[PDB]
Write a protein that binds this ligand. Sequence first.
Ligand SMILES: COc1ccc([C@H]2CCC(=O)NC2=O)cc1
Ligand SMILES: [Zn+2]
Length: 106
Amino acid sequence: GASIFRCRQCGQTISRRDWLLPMGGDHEHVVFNPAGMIFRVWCFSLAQGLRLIGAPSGEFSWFKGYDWTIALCGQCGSHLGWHYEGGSQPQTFFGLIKDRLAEGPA
Ligand SMILES: COc1ccc([C@H]2CCC(=O)NC2=O)cc1
Ligand SMILES: [Zn+2]
C-alpha cells in the first residue's frame, strides 16, 4: 500500500516503513542545523540507494554519541539526510528528511 520510501526527486529506492526506528521513543525528530534550517527527520535502521559523502563528523550532531555523514540520493544527488555511526544501541542508523521522500507500494 505505502510500504516503500523513494527519493521524491527521482524515484530511487531508499527505505521502507518496516525499517523505521523509534529513537528516544519516536521515529520523528524535528531539528535545526547551524543555518537555522528546520528538518523533519525520520530515523531508519536501514536504507539503500544513498551515497555517503565524506568522513563522519560529530560537530553539531543532533544525536548524542553519534557522528554523521551526509547522505545523498545515490541516483540524483539530492540531500536526503545523514548516516549516523559511532554510537551505541544501535551503533548506526539513518536520519532521513521526511519531506524529501515519497511513500508508496512495494
Ligand atoms: C554546514 O554546516 C552544518 C553542520 C551540521 C549540520 C547537521 C548535520 C547533521 C546533524 O546531526 N546536525 C546538524 O546540525 C548541517 C549543516
Ligand atoms: Zn533522487
